[PDB]
Amino acid sequence: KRQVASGRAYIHASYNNTIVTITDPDGNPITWSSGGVIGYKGSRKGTPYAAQLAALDAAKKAMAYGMQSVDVIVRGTGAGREQAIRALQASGLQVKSIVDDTPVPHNGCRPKKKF
Amino acid sequence: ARRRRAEVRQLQPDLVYGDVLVTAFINKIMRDGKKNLAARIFYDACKIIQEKTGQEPLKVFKQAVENVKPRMEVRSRRVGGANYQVPMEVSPRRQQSLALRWLVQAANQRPERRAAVRIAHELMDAAEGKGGAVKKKEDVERMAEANRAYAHYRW
Amino acid sequence: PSRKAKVKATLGEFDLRDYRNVEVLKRFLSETGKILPRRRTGLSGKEQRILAKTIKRARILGLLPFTEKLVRK
RNA sequence: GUGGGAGAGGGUGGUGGAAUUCCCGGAGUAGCGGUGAAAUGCGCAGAUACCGGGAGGAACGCCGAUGGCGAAGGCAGCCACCUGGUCCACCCGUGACGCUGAGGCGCGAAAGCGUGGGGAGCAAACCGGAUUAGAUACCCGGGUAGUCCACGCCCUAAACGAUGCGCGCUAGGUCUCUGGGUCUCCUGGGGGCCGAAGCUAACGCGUUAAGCGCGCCGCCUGGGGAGUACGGCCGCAAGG
């Protein structure tokens, strides 16, 4: 118990694994859940189900801190970005607003072989 | 089937009860087209239900079927050079088909000697939610949401 | 379709070179901080070419953004 | 000559924000990352995801086009300075002063060479991981030269429109950048597509000619052997 109502929920999606981190209003993470932490270990994490789980068990750990309100922040394009959000929208948390602030360079580091 | 959906064969109701669901069931018992025998099996198998159960076998039959129709199944699919099991919602046609077929495939596995009996008993333990006709049901669905990790393809 | 309403049609006489007029420019930026394409601005080959340079200026004087975040998704 | 215009044309100095890596702090756990799968690797000296702070190099989203500029190679964040080309209008001034152009001189992508600086990302070679009958590969994780900067050299190329420069002449339609006009239309320069006559082995070309013609340079003359051999010239070398 630490009683921290209303916080932020960063959702970091990939083409290899989706994760979630729940931070406090200030920006400090309270509890974070990935995909490889649930049980799955490889090709499995990219799945929308993998993300679903990752999202849900990540809220269950927040309800423990009395988390009620949350602003959702999505990072990137993964496989099941959606399902992660739709997850929190049913986990029992009040969803303020969904934010998309995926990091696009304005042409900087020369990307590697696979663009 | 390549050009059309192919019309489904309409059957003749039963001479006794009159439910076509009956006709379907027997057909499934019938081997080597001995439909005169297959009929007796069902009948005497109903008589066993009256003597051992205080209910009308017609209704009993139905509740049994009703209870085995699995509502979820798997369908193999080569997605990216691999066998991914893809759960999917089952149609009314297939349900009916699967039920009867399992009611009989399980039935004949019973440790009982007489065939009319073996069927009679499967129709009872069925309704009560047990036996093996219903086990081959829960075993299927136990694969449905088992790999519901993959429900994101076709349909 | 993109046949919503161009920003030139719903606007008045305004100087393309006054890079300080934020109240207007903002009309030329997307829901993000990006520069609207000609299909959306309603402008011409020459106009857009200028409006381009002008925004990159007001950006510099911390007036107009370089990129926003999104409200839905 | 005078008055307009457009442009990623070049040079120098400067400066803006995104992202990346690294460093520090905060908070926080058990994984992260990567693949068709996987492993190599990174994490309890606490990684990942998240916030804040700092350093540094590279590059410059959107606008951006089937667009513009340039002799070509090639050129795009913003600003200022220095500078080349060019187009239009007026028809003012010179009075044929013009075209071409062996050798020459200059420019010349990428890689590569010297000395010095710099090094974030990427990445020959090289080190491991997996794949396979095998893999000195295609895939994954690292990684040195190099790639960025200066001065100097190298000078090649599918350096391509694979189409030398310059002038005149020969239906149009349409889209587009740009200038003048009496501007629902005329008129100049440029970029595209379709297409008359004509040409073409055909494909195609077609007022951006591969058409009808004149000038001048360059080059070809069976394939392989060879862009080799010899010789000379060049270069630090690689080589040309």
Coordinates of C-alpha atoms (C1' of nucleotides) in Angstrom, one line a residue:
Chain A
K1 CA 0.0 0.0 0.0
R2 CA 1.2 3.5 -1.0
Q3 CA -2.1 5.1 -2.2
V4 CA -1.4 6.7 -5.6
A5 CA -4.7 7.2 -7.4
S6 CA -4.8 8.4 -11.0
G7 CA -1.6 7.8 -13.1
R8 CA 0.0 7.3 -16.5
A9 CA 0.1 4.1 -18.5
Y10 CA 2.9 3.9 -21.1
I11 CA 2.4 1.1 -23.7
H12 CA 5.6 0.3 -25.6
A13 CA 4.8 -1.9 -28.6
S14 CA 7.2 -3.7 -30.9
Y15 CA 7.4 -6.3 -33.6
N16 CA 9.1 -8.6 -31.1
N17 CA 7.3 -8.0 -27.8
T18 CA 4.8 -5.5 -26.2
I19 CA 5.2 -4.0 -22.7
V20 CA 3.5 -1.7 -20.4
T21 CA 4.8 0.5 -17.6
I22 CA 2.5 2.3 -15.2
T23 CA 3.9 5.5 -13.8
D24 CA 2.7 8.1 -11.4
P25 CA 1.4 11.6 -12.4
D26 CA 5.0 12.9 -12.0
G27 CA 6.3 10.3 -14.4
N28 CA 7.8 7.7 -12.0
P29 CA 6.9 4.1 -12.7
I30 CA 5.0 2.2 -10.0
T31 CA 4.8 -1.3 -11.6
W32 CA 5.7 -2.5 -15.1
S33 CA 4.6 -5.6 -17.0
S34 CA 6.1 -7.0 -20.3
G35 CA 5.2 -10.0 -22.3
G36 CA 8.2 -12.2 -21.5
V37 CA 7.3 -11.7 -17.9
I38 CA 3.9 -13.4 -18.2
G39 CA 5.2 -16.7 -19.4
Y40 CA 5.7 -16.5 -23.1
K41 CA 9.3 -16.4 -24.4
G42 CA 9.7 -15.9 -28.2
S43 CA 7.5 -15.6 -31.3
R44 CA 4.7 -15.6 -28.7
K45 CA 5.2 -12.0 -27.3
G46 CA 4.2 -10.3 -30.5
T47 CA 0.7 -11.7 -30.3
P48 CA -2.2 -9.4 -29.5
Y49 CA -3.2 -11.9 -26.8
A50 CA 0.3 -11.5 -25.4
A51 CA -0.3 -7.8 -25.2
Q52 CA -3.8 -8.3 -23.8
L53 CA -2.3 -10.2 -20.9
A54 CA 0.6 -7.9 -20.5
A55 CA -1.9 -5.0 -20.2
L56 CA -4.3 -6.7 -17.7
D57 CA -1.8 -8.1 -15.2
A58 CA -0.2 -4.7 -15.4
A59 CA -3.4 -3.1 -14.1
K60 CA -4.0 -5.8 -11.4
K61 CA -0.7 -4.6 -9.9
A62 CA -1.9 -1.0 -10.0
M63 CA -5.3 -1.7 -8.4
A64 CA -3.1 -2.8 -5.5
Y65 CA -1.9 0.8 -5.3
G66 CA -5.4 2.0 -5.6
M67 CA -5.0 3.3 -9.1
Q68 CA -8.2 4.5 -10.6
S69 CA -7.8 7.1 -13.3
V70 CA -5.2 6.7 -16.1
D71 CA -4.0 8.5 -19.2
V72 CA -2.8 6.1 -21.9
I73 CA 0.4 6.7 -23.8
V74 CA 1.2 4.5 -26.9
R75 CA 4.7 4.2 -28.3
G76 CA 5.1 2.8 -31.8
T77 CA 3.5 0.2 -34.0
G78 CA 3.5 -3.3 -32.8
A79 CA 1.1 -6.2 -33.3
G80 CA -1.8 -5.6 -31.1
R81 CA -1.3 -2.0 -30.0
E82 CA -5.0 -1.8 -30.1
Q83 CA -5.8 -4.9 -28.0
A84 CA -3.5 -3.4 -25.2
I85 CA -5.6 -0.2 -25.0
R86 CA -8.9 -2.0 -25.3
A87 CA -7.5 -4.1 -22.4
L88 CA -7.2 -1.2 -20.0
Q89 CA -10.6 0.0 -21.2
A90 CA -12.0 -3.1 -19.5
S91 CA -9.5 -3.8 -16.7
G92 CA -11.6 -1.6 -14.5
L93 CA -9.6 1.6 -14.9
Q94 CA -11.1 5.0 -15.9
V95 CA -9.4 5.9 -19.2
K96 CA -8.8 9.6 -19.5
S97 CA -7.4 10.0 -23.0
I98 CA -5.3 8.0 -25.4
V99 CA -2.1 9.7 -26.6
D100 CA 0.0 8.9 -29.6
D101 CA 3.5 10.2 -29.3
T102 CA 5.5 7.6 -31.2
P103 CA 9.1 8.8 -31.8
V104 CA 9.7 9.7 -35.5
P105 CA 13.2 11.1 -36.3
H106 CA 13.5 14.1 -38.5
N107 CA 16.2 12.2 -40.4
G108 CA 19.1 11.4 -38.1
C109 CA 20.9 8.2 -37.4
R110 CA 21.4 6.2 -40.6
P111 CA 19.1 3.2 -39.9
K112 CA 20.6 -0.3 -40.3
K113 CA 20.2 -2.9 -43.1
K114 CA 16.5 -3.7 -42.5
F115 CA 14.8 -0.3 -42.8
Chain B
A1 CA -17.9 -28.4 -53.7
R2 CA -16.5 -25.8 -56.1
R3 CA -19.3 -24.1 -58.0
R4 CA -22.1 -23.9 -55.4
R5 CA -22.8 -24.3 -51.8
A6 CA -24.5 -27.7 -52.6
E7 CA -28.1 -28.1 -51.3
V8 CA -28.5 -30.2 -48.1
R9 CA -30.4 -33.4 -48.1
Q10 CA -33.8 -33.1 -46.6
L11 CA -34.7 -36.3 -44.7
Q12 CA -38.0 -38.0 -43.9
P13 CA -39.3 -37.6 -40.3
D14 CA -39.7 -40.5 -38.0
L15 CA -42.8 -42.9 -38.3
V16 CA -43.0 -42.9 -34.5
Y17 CA -42.1 -39.5 -33.1
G18 CA -41.8 -37.5 -36.3
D19 CA -38.8 -35.5 -35.4
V20 CA -36.2 -35.5 -38.3
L21 CA -33.5 -35.2 -35.6
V22 CA -34.4 -38.8 -35.0
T23 CA -33.8 -39.9 -38.6
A24 CA -30.5 -38.2 -38.6
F25 CA -29.4 -40.0 -35.5
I26 CA -30.3 -43.5 -36.7
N27 CA -28.6 -42.9 -40.1
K28 CA -25.5 -42.4 -38.0
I29 CA -25.9 -45.7 -36.3
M30 CA -26.7 -47.6 -39.5
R31 CA -23.9 -49.6 -40.9
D32 CA -23.9 -51.4 -44.2
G33 CA -27.3 -49.7 -44.9
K34 CA -29.1 -52.0 -42.5
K35 CA -31.6 -49.2 -41.6
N36 CA -34.2 -51.6 -40.4
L37 CA -31.8 -52.7 -37.6
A38 CA -30.4 -49.3 -36.9
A39 CA -34.0 -48.3 -36.2
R40 CA -34.6 -51.1 -33.7
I41 CA -31.4 -50.0 -31.8
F42 CA -32.8 -46.6 -31.2
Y43 CA -36.2 -47.8 -30.3
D44 CA -35.4 -50.4 -27.7
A45 CA -32.7 -47.9 -26.6
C46 CA -35.6 -45.6 -25.8
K47 CA -37.5 -48.2 -23.9
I48 CA -34.5 -48.5 -21.6
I49 CA -35.0 -44.8 -20.8
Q50 CA -38.6 -45.2 -19.8
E51 CA -37.8 -48.1 -17.4
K52 CA -34.7 -46.5 -16.0
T53 CA -35.8 -42.9 -16.2
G54 CA -39.1 -41.3 -15.4
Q55 CA -39.1 -39.1 -18.5
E56 CA -40.1 -39.1 -22.2
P57 CA -37.1 -40.3 -24.3
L58 CA -37.9 -37.8 -27.1
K59 CA -37.1 -34.8 -24.9
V60 CA -34.2 -36.7 -23.3
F61 CA -32.7 -37.3 -26.7
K62 CA -32.9 -33.6 -27.5
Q63 CA -31.4 -32.3 -24.3
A64 CA -28.5 -34.7 -24.9
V65 CA -27.8 -33.4 -28.4
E66 CA -28.3 -29.8 -27.3
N67 CA -25.6 -30.4 -24.7
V68 CA -22.9 -31.9 -27.0
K69 CA -23.0 -29.4 -29.9
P70 CA -19.6 -27.7 -29.3
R71 CA -19.8 -24.0 -29.9
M72 CA -16.0 -23.5 -30.5
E73 CA -13.4 -25.4 -32.5
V74 CA -10.1 -25.4 -34.2
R75 CA -9.1 -25.3 -37.9
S76 CA -5.6 -25.9 -39.1
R77 CA -3.9 -23.2 -41.2
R78 CA -0.4 -22.6 -42.8
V79 CA 0.3 -19.1 -41.8
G80 CA 4.0 -18.3 -42.7
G81 CA 5.2 -21.9 -43.3
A82 CA 3.7 -23.1 -40.0
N83 CA 0.6 -25.0 -38.5
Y84 CA -1.3 -22.4 -36.5
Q85 CA -4.4 -23.7 -34.9
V86 CA -7.1 -21.1 -35.5
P87 CA -10.2 -21.2 -33.2
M88 CA -13.5 -20.3 -34.8
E89 CA -17.3 -19.9 -34.3
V90 CA -19.1 -23.1 -35.3
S91 CA -22.2 -23.1 -37.5
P92 CA -25.7 -24.7 -36.8
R93 CA -25.1 -27.2 -39.6
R94 CA -21.8 -28.5 -38.2
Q95 CA -22.9 -28.5 -34.6
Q96 CA -25.8 -30.9 -35.3
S97 CA -23.4 -33.0 -37.4
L98 CA -20.7 -33.2 -34.7
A99 CA -23.0 -34.0 -31.9
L100 CA -24.7 -37.1 -33.3
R101 CA -21.4 -38.4 -34.6
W102 CA -19.8 -38.2 -31.2
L103 CA -22.8 -39.6 -29.5
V104 CA -22.2 -42.7 -31.5
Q105 CA -18.4 -42.8 -31.6
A106 CA -18.3 -42.6 -27.8
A107 CA -21.3 -44.8 -27.4
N108 CA -19.7 -47.9 -29.0
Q109 CA -16.7 -47.5 -26.7
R110 CA -18.7 -48.2 -23.5
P111 CA -17.8 -51.4 -21.6
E112 CA -21.4 -52.7 -22.2
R113 CA -22.2 -55.7 -24.3
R114 CA -25.6 -55.0 -26.0
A115 CA -25.7 -52.0 -28.5
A116 CA -29.2 -50.7 -27.8
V117 CA -28.1 -50.3 -24.2
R118 CA -24.8 -48.7 -25.0
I119 CA -26.7 -46.0 -26.8
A120 CA -29.4 -45.6 -24.2
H121 CA -26.8 -45.0 -21.5
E122 CA -24.9 -42.4 -23.5
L123 CA -28.1 -40.4 -24.0
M124 CA -28.5 -40.3 -20.2
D125 CA -25.0 -39.5 -18.9
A126 CA -25.0 -36.9 -21.7
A127 CA -27.8 -34.8 -20.3
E128 CA -26.3 -35.0 -16.8
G129 CA -23.2 -33.5 -18.3
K130 CA -20.9 -36.4 -18.3
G131 CA -19.8 -39.6 -19.9
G132 CA -17.5 -39.2 -22.9
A133 CA -19.7 -37.8 -25.6
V134 CA -19.6 -34.6 -23.6
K135 CA -15.9 -35.2 -22.8
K136 CA -15.0 -35.1 -26.5
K137 CA -16.8 -31.7 -26.4
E138 CA -15.0 -30.1 -23.5
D139 CA -11.8 -31.5 -24.9
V140 CA -12.4 -29.6 -28.2
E141 CA -13.4 -26.3 -26.6
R142 CA -10.4 -26.9 -24.3
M143 CA -8.3 -26.3 -27.4
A144 CA -10.4 -23.3 -28.5
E145 CA -9.6 -20.8 -25.9
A146 CA -6.4 -22.8 -25.3
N147 CA -4.7 -21.2 -28.3
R148 CA -7.0 -18.2 -28.5
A149 CA -3.6 -16.6 -28.8
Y150 CA -4.2 -16.9 -32.5
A151 CA -7.8 -15.6 -33.0
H152 CA -6.8 -12.7 -35.2
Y153 CA -6.7 -14.2 -38.8
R154 CA -9.6 -15.2 -41.0
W155 CA -13.3 -14.6 -40.0
Chain C
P1 CA -12.3 12.3 -50.4
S2 CA -10.4 15.3 -48.8
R3 CA -13.3 17.5 -49.9
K4 CA -13.8 18.8 -46.4
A5 CA -13.0 22.5 -46.7
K6 CA -9.8 24.1 -47.8
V7 CA -8.1 26.6 -45.4
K8 CA -7.8 29.3 -48.1
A9 CA -11.6 29.2 -48.8
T10 CA -12.4 29.6 -45.1
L11 CA -10.0 32.5 -44.3
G12 CA -9.4 36.1 -45.5
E13 CA -6.6 38.3 -47.0
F14 CA -3.4 37.5 -45.1
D15 CA 0.3 38.0 -45.6
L16 CA 2.3 34.9 -46.4
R17 CA 5.5 36.5 -45.3
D18 CA 4.5 37.6 -41.7
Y19 CA 5.9 34.8 -39.8
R20 CA 4.7 36.2 -36.5
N21 CA 1.0 35.8 -37.2
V22 CA 0.4 32.7 -35.3
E23 CA -3.4 33.0 -35.1
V24 CA -3.4 32.1 -38.9
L25 CA -0.5 29.7 -39.5
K26 CA -1.9 27.3 -36.9
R27 CA -4.7 26.9 -39.5
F28 CA -2.0 25.4 -41.8
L29 CA -0.7 22.9 -39.4
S30 CA -2.2 19.4 -38.9
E31 CA -3.6 17.8 -35.7
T32 CA 0.1 17.0 -35.3
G33 CA 2.8 19.7 -35.9
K34 CA 3.2 18.8 -39.5
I35 CA 2.6 21.1 -42.5
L36 CA -0.6 20.5 -44.4
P37 CA -0.3 19.2 -48.0
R38 CA -1.5 21.5 -50.8
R39 CA -4.6 19.3 -51.2
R40 CA -5.5 20.5 -47.7
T41 CA -4.1 24.1 -47.7
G42 CA -5.9 25.1 -50.8
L43 CA -2.8 27.1 -51.9
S44 CA -0.8 27.3 -55.1
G45 CA 2.6 26.2 -56.3
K46 CA 4.1 29.5 -55.2
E47 CA 2.0 30.1 -52.2
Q48 CA 2.8 26.8 -50.5
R49 CA 6.4 27.2 -51.4
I50 CA 6.4 30.4 -49.3
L51 CA 4.1 29.3 -46.5
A52 CA 6.6 26.5 -46.2
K53 CA 9.5 28.8 -45.5
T54 CA 7.4 31.0 -43.2
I55 CA 6.4 28.2 -40.9
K56 CA 9.9 26.9 -40.5
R57 CA 10.6 30.4 -39.2
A58 CA 7.9 30.8 -36.7
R59 CA 9.0 27.4 -35.5
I60 CA 12.4 28.8 -34.8
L61 CA 10.9 31.7 -32.8
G62 CA 9.1 29.1 -30.6
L63 CA 5.8 30.2 -32.0
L64 CA 4.6 27.2 -34.0
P65 CA 5.4 23.6 -33.0
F66 CA 7.6 21.1 -34.8
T67 CA 5.4 18.1 -33.8
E68 CA 2.4 17.5 -31.5
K69 CA 1.0 14.4 -29.9
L70 CA -2.3 12.6 -31.0
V71 CA -5.6 12.7 -29.1
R72 CA -7.2 9.5 -30.2
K73 CA -5.8 6.1 -31.8
Chain D
rG1 C1' 21.4 49.0 -71.2
rU2 C1' 16.9 49.6 -68.1
rG3 C1' 12.8 47.3 -65.1
rG4 C1' 10.9 42.9 -63.3
rG5 C1' 11.0 37.2 -61.6
rA6 C1' 12.0 32.0 -60.0
rG7 C1' 15.2 28.5 -58.2
rA8 C1' 17.7 22.0 -53.0
rG9 C1' 22.8 26.5 -58.6
rG10 C1' 27.9 27.2 -55.6
rG11 C1' 31.2 29.3 -51.0
rU12 C1' 31.8 31.0 -45.8
rG13 C1' 29.8 31.8 -40.9
rG14 C1' 26.3 30.8 -38.2
rU15 C1' 22.1 28.7 -35.6
rG16 C1' 16.9 25.1 -34.7
rG17 C1' 14.1 21.1 -33.4
rA18 C1' 13.1 15.3 -33.8
rA19 C1' 15.6 10.9 -33.1
rU20 C1' 20.2 7.8 -31.7
rU21 C1' 24.2 6.5 -28.4
rC22 C1' 26.6 7.4 -24.0
rC23 C1' 26.9 9.7 -18.7
rC24 C1' 24.2 11.2 -13.9
rG25 C1' 20.1 11.4 -11.0
rG26 C1' 14.9 9.7 -10.0
rA27 C1' 11.6 6.0 -9.7
rG28 C1' 11.0 0.2 -10.8
rU29 C1' 11.4 -5.3 -11.5
rA30 C1' 12.9 -9.8 -14.2
rG31 C1' 13.6 -9.7 -18.2
rC32 C1' 15.1 -7.3 -22.3
rG33 C1' 16.6 -7.9 -27.4
rG34 C1' 16.2 -10.6 -31.9
rU35 C1' 14.0 -14.6 -35.5
rG36 C1' 10.6 -18.4 -40.1
rA37 C1' 11.9 -20.5 -35.5
rA38 C1' 15.7 -20.0 -32.4
rA39 C1' 20.2 -19.0 -30.2
rU40 C1' 24.9 -15.5 -29.8
rG41 C1' 24.3 -10.7 -26.5
rC42 C1' 22.8 -7.5 -22.8
rG43 C1' 20.3 -7.7 -17.0
rC44 C1' 20.0 -8.6 -9.4
rA45 C1' 27.4 -4.3 -10.1
rG46 C1' 19.6 -4.1 -11.0
rA47 C1' 18.8 -4.3 -17.9
rU48 C1' 14.1 -3.4 -20.3
rA49 C1' 9.9 0.1 -20.5
rC50 C1' 9.1 5.4 -17.9
rC51 C1' 10.7 11.0 -16.0
rG52 C1' 14.5 14.7 -15.5
rG53 C1' 19.2 16.4 -16.3
rG54 C1' 23.8 16.5 -19.2
rA55 C1' 27.5 15.3 -23.6
rG56 C1' 28.4 14.4 -28.5
rG57 C1' 28.3 13.2 -34.0
rA58 C1' 25.5 12.6 -37.9
rA59 C1' 21.9 14.0 -40.5
rC60 C1' 17.9 17.2 -41.6
rG61 C1' 10.7 14.7 -41.1
rC62 C1' 6.3 17.3 -42.7
rC63 C1' 6.2 21.2 -46.9
rG64 C1' 8.2 17.7 -51.1
rA65 C1' 5.6 16.8 -56.4
rU66 C1' 4.9 12.3 -61.8
rG67 C1' 8.3 19.9 -58.8
rG68 C1' 13.1 23.5 -59.2
rC69 C1' 18.2 24.5 -60.3
rG70 C1' 22.6 23.4 -62.6
rA71 C1' 27.5 22.1 -68.1
rA72 C1' 28.0 17.5 -66.1
rG73 C1' 29.3 14.9 -61.4
rG74 C1' 25.4 16.7 -58.4
rC75 C1' 22.0 20.0 -55.1
rA76 C1' 17.0 20.0 -50.3
rG77 C1' 16.4 22.4 -41.7
rC78 C1' 16.6 28.2 -40.9
rC79 C1' 19.6 32.9 -41.4
rA80 C1' 23.2 36.4 -43.2
rC81 C1' 27.0 37.6 -46.1
rC82 C1' 30.0 36.7 -50.7
rU83 C1' 28.9 34.5 -56.1
rG84 C1' 27.6 32.0 -61.1
rG85 C1' 23.5 30.8 -64.6
rU86 C1' 18.7 32.3 -66.4
rC87 C1' 14.0 33.9 -68.0
rC88 C1' 10.4 37.8 -69.3
rA89 C1' 9.0 42.9 -70.8
rC90 C1' 10.8 47.8 -73.2
rC91 C1' 13.1 47.8 -78.0
rC92 C1' 17.2 51.9 -76.0
rG93 C1' 22.8 51.0 -77.4
rU94 C1' 26.8 48.5 -80.3
rG95 C1' 26.9 46.6 -85.6
rA96 C1' 27.8 40.2 -87.5
rC97 C1' 31.5 41.3 -83.0
rG98 C1' 28.9 34.6 -84.8
rC99 C1' 28.9 28.4 -84.5
rU100 C1' 32.1 24.6 -83.6
rG101 C1' 36.0 23.4 -81.4
rA102 C1' 42.6 18.5 -82.2
rG103 C1' 46.0 19.4 -78.2
rG104 C1' 45.6 22.4 -73.7
rC105 C1' 43.5 24.2 -68.8
rG106 C1' 39.5 23.5 -65.3
rC107 C1' 35.5 20.6 -63.1
rG108 C1' 34.4 15.5 -62.1
rA109 C1' 29.5 10.5 -57.9
rA110 C1' 31.1 6.0 -54.8
rA111 C1' 34.9 3.8 -53.3
rG112 C1' 40.2 4.4 -52.4
rC113 C1' 45.6 7.1 -51.0
rG114 C1' 48.6 10.9 -47.5
rU115 C1' 48.8 14.1 -42.9
rG116 C1' 45.7 16.0 -39.0
rG117 C1' 40.9 16.3 -36.6
rG118 C1' 36.6 13.9 -35.4
rG119 C1' 33.4 9.1 -34.4
rA120 C1' 26.6 9.4 -32.7
rG121 C1' 24.5 5.8 -36.5
rC122 C1' 25.9 2.4 -40.0
rA123 C1' 29.3 -1.0 -41.5
rA124 C1' 34.2 -4.5 -46.0
rA125 C1' 37.4 -7.3 -43.4
rC126 C1' 37.5 -9.8 -38.9
rC127 C1' 34.8 -12.4 -33.9
rG128 C1' 30.9 -15.3 -32.5
rG129 C1' 25.4 -17.0 -33.2
rA130 C1' 21.7 -20.0 -36.4
rU131 C1' 20.4 -22.2 -41.2
rU132 C1' 22.3 -26.4 -44.3
rA133 C1' 24.3 -32.6 -47.0
rG134 C1' 28.0 -28.4 -46.3
rA135 C1' 27.7 -22.3 -46.0
rU136 C1' 34.0 -19.6 -46.3
rA137 C1' 26.1 -16.6 -47.9
rC138 C1' 21.5 -15.0 -47.7
rC139 C1' 19.1 -14.1 -41.2
rC140 C1' 20.9 -12.5 -35.6
rG141 C1' 24.6 -10.1 -32.1
rG142 C1' 29.3 -7.5 -32.1
rG143 C1' 32.9 -5.0 -34.9
rU144 C1' 38.1 -2.2 -37.4
rA145 C1' 39.0 0.7 -42.0
rG146 C1' 35.5 3.8 -43.8
rU147 C1' 31.7 6.6 -43.8
rC148 C1' 31.5 13.4 -41.2
rC149 C1' 35.6 17.9 -41.3
rA150 C1' 40.2 20.3 -43.3
rC151 C1' 44.2 20.6 -46.8
rG152 C1' 46.2 17.5 -50.6
rC153 C1' 46.1 13.3 -54.4
rC154 C1' 43.1 9.8 -57.1
rC155 C1' 39.6 10.7 -62.2
rU156 C1' 37.0 6.0 -62.9
rA157 C1' 31.3 4.8 -63.7
rA158 C1' 24.8 1.5 -66.4
rA159 C1' 29.6 9.6 -65.4
rC160 C1' 22.6 6.9 -69.4
rG161 C1' 18.4 10.7 -72.3
rA162 C1' 23.0 4.2 -72.8
rU163 C1' 20.8 10.0 -77.9
rG164 C1' 27.8 16.1 -79.1
rC165 C1' 27.2 21.5 -79.6
rG166 C1' 24.8 25.4 -82.4
rC167 C1' 20.8 27.6 -86.1
rG168 C1' 16.4 27.3 -89.3
rC169 C1' 12.2 24.5 -90.9
rU170 C1' 7.6 20.9 -90.3
rA171 C1' -0.8 19.8 -87.3
rG172 C1' -2.2 19.5 -82.7
rG173 C1' -4.2 17.9 -77.6
rU174 C1' -3.5 17.8 -72.8
rC175 C1' -1.1 18.3 -67.6
rU176 C1' 2.5 21.1 -65.0
rC177 C1' 6.8 25.1 -63.0
rU178 C1' 7.8 30.0 -64.4
rG179 C1' 7.5 35.6 -66.9
rG180 C1' 4.6 39.6 -69.9
rG181 C1' -0.3 40.7 -71.7
rU182 C1' -5.8 44.3 -73.0
rC183 C1' -5.6 37.6 -68.1
rU184 C1' -12.8 32.9 -69.2
rC185 C1' -8.0 34.2 -73.8
rC186 C1' -3.3 35.7 -76.1
rU187 C1' 2.1 35.6 -75.6
rG188 C1' 7.6 33.8 -74.0
rG189 C1' 11.0 30.0 -71.6
rG190 C1' 11.1 24.9 -69.1
rG191 C1' 9.3 19.9 -67.5
rG192 C1' 5.9 15.5 -68.8
rC193 C1' 2.2 12.3 -71.4
rC194 C1' -0.7 11.5 -76.4
rG195 C1' -0.1 12.2 -81.2
rA196 C1' 0.0 14.8 -88.1
rA197 C1' 3.5 14.6 -91.9
rG198 C1' 8.0 12.1 -91.8
rC199 C1' 11.6 8.4 -89.8
rU200 C1' 12.6 3.6 -88.0
rA201 C1' 15.0 -3.5 -88.5
rA202 C1' 11.4 -3.1 -85.1
rC203 C1' 10.5 -1.0 -80.0
rG204 C1' 9.9 3.4 -80.7
rC205 C1' 10.9 8.6 -82.0
rG206 C1' 7.6 12.7 -83.1
rU207 C1' 8.4 21.5 -82.5
rU208 C1' 12.1 18.6 -75.1
rA209 C1' 13.0 14.6 -83.0
rA210 C1' 15.3 9.2 -83.3
rG211 C1' 11.7 14.2 -88.6
rC212 C1' 13.8 18.0 -93.4
rG213 C1' 18.3 20.3 -93.5
rC214 C1' 23.8 23.3 -92.9
rG215 C1' 28.5 23.9 -89.9
rC216 C1' 32.0 21.8 -86.7
rC217 C1' 34.2 18.1 -83.2
rG218 C1' 34.0 13.0 -81.2
rC219 C1' 33.7 7.6 -82.3
rC220 C1' 32.4 2.3 -84.8
rU221 C1' 34.3 -0.9 -89.1
rG222 C1' 32.6 -9.5 -87.3
rG223 C1' 32.8 -12.6 -81.7
rG224 C1' 36.4 -14.5 -78.4
rG225 C1' 41.2 -13.6 -77.3
rA226 C1' 41.3 -7.9 -74.3
rG227 C1' 40.3 -3.3 -72.3
rU228 C1' 44.6 -8.0 -71.9
rA229 C1' 50.2 -7.9 -74.1
rC230 C1' 54.2 -4.5 -75.5
rG231 C1' 55.6 0.7 -75.4
rG232 C1' 55.0 5.5 -73.5
rC233 C1' 52.5 9.0 -70.4
rC234 C1' 50.5 9.8 -65.6
rG235 C1' 50.1 8.4 -59.8
rC236 C1' 52.5 7.9 -53.2
rA237 C1' 50.1 3.4 -54.1
rA238 C1' 45.8 1.2 -55.6
rG239 C1' 45.8 1.9 -60.5
rG240 C1' 44.5 5.0 -64.7

